């Protein structure tokens, strides 16, 4: 099954993602194919998939930016029916906004079926143009048609996945304890993590004994990423990944505070020094506490 | 040690 | 002995505190007697006392606001010698800025002796006026003279004192772990703690599932008090007290994040809800983690 | 429970 999470949904035939046009929250905003840049935040092209209780493999798809839902216009089963952004809720019974998402016949891409109409999300004519129509269309679960096949590029981790990434790190102290705060996290490209740091005012901040030392920098950076999350996105039900760690050196006679993020493949953590914006695989401390 |  | 810490230094004879005039960092700024308001931050009247290694009962006294040191002008032993703010360092060998501070004959107030001159800090003529001269003056350790007696009203806690206050609270979970970040903390009046919250932008913030929920409010409030500390004070070697806690309810089926501060008498913690600015003795959760 |  598709897991709860945030996805960048990419056509199997051409490099077009599912895009809410101009990120608009207006009801009836067209959802279109659009080109994308890997290893960025594609602002209008992220979708939170919420599983529906007691309906197998069926989800709402909420645009992270607008907070509006993928909606099959009037639930029509006619081929060519508009797919738009529309106001809704995460656990709606409105079948216009319910989508059954299961693996295609290639076992890697998915098909997206409207629960009401039983028609499929279709990049019409496989058009690679920016702004190409996406429609509900006749189809089957088993056919090869790439117009109706979609790669669900997972952009989020669960708290379980974040925990596993920390646990396989070689710089964790014997006494380590972690404290999980949220359930599902958007993983930032380092380019975006760096931009939030650059815009926080921390690059200008001076180290001062106790009054603005390592713990102040690390907590400020976590607060800055929290503020950015709320200010940037209108959807709810996820957080932005940014951890704080406390660490102790090999000799056991110095301790530090710093941040951490996750690799592109979501498998490993990377340390971030908020005093200088550096990313490190070894920050010279073993972590004895984290909260994230 | 103290967090510094 | 006087402990390392931040003090509001109040004359034993009249309600005048030791005040760095206008908080000025200029060398030779007069240090004067001035009236004060209890249960506020008296901005020009806080002094960080740093003990000198291997010199018994001897300290530098750094004005928290200016970052400049109490200085006996040219170290003169003449009665009436100016006491001023002057640039220095926490562990100076400059005897103009070194002060032996021991209990007076009443066993509650102190006398303040310049280490070089062996004269005493004196509120001249016991003048209660705002801006009254404070001078180095002839005296003895044992005499009753209230012009030369000073109550050292302790405004800070050690991390050991903060730990003891948490430990005697009745709302601590069996599994509690605390993580100390700094050594010596200025304890805020609730009026100041509230002002920092009011000026943080948190009063306007809306609760949102995961993306700005309890953990975001509590970490934002700690970051806001950290920023206020660095921006407000020029001295180094202390922090502002503001804790984050994670808690779990009696039933063990809900958890929350919130802040905490300390009572006036420094003996107990008080919980702070950053979602509504309320202070509580019981916030309906038992703390299983804190960092402060 | 989750911190909420
Ligand atoms: C190139 C073209 O691909 C297929 O046709 C698709 C359409 O396919 C879908 O709709 C048709 C009916 O129009 C049929 O139900 C099919 O099973 C279903 O997958 C559709 O994707 C549209 C819009 O993008 O484009 C093409 O017309 C195939 O059936 C055609 O024979 C032909 O190979
Ligand atoms: C009211 C007055 O109090 C005392 O005199 C103080 C001064 O006391 C100090 O200096 C004198 C010498 O001038 C002497 O060395 C004394 O032991 C020492 O405490 C001083 O505090 C000044 C400035 O504030 O005010 C008074 O002159 C006392 O000795 C006087 O007899 C008289 O009772
Ligand atoms: C917020 C906005 O994002 C970008 O423009 C979007 C655009 O973004 C995608 O397409 C562009 C090329 O037009 C790039 O490939 C980006 O990497 C894609 O994410 C689309 O989403 C369209 C249609 O909804 O809206 C634009 O606003 C960027 O070019 C803007 O400067 C700006 O940052
Ligand atoms: C920062 C400044 O603080 C106050 O003025 C100070 C003044 O503060 C003390 O004396 C006033 C009465 O003049 C009150 O009792 C305060 O409670 C005291 O802390 C002195 O420190 C003088 C001399 O250095 O400087 C003033 O700036 C306050 O009145 C101002 O509005 C302002 O907040
Ligand atoms: Ca949470
Ligand atoms: Ca600190
Ligand atoms: Ca510290
Ligand atoms: Ca959160
Ligand atoms: Na429309
Ligand atoms: Na389901
Ligand atoms: Na002067
Ligand atoms: Na000493």
UniProtKB/TrEMBL annotation, chains A, C:
Zn(2+) 3 binds at residue 147. Mn(2+) 2 binds at residues 181-182, 213, 215. Zn(2+) 2 binds at residue 96. Mn(2+) 1 binds at residues 171, 286. Zn(2+) 6 binds at residue 282. The keyword Ribosomal protein does not apply. Keywords: Calcium, Metal-binding, Zinc. InterPro entries: Agglutinin_C, Papain-like_cys_pep_sf, Ricin_B-like_lectins, Ricin_B_lectin. Mn(2+) 3 binds at residues 182, 210, 213, 215-216. Zn(2+) 5 binds at residues 214, 256. This is Agglutinin. It comes from Marasmius oreades (fairy-ring Marasmius).
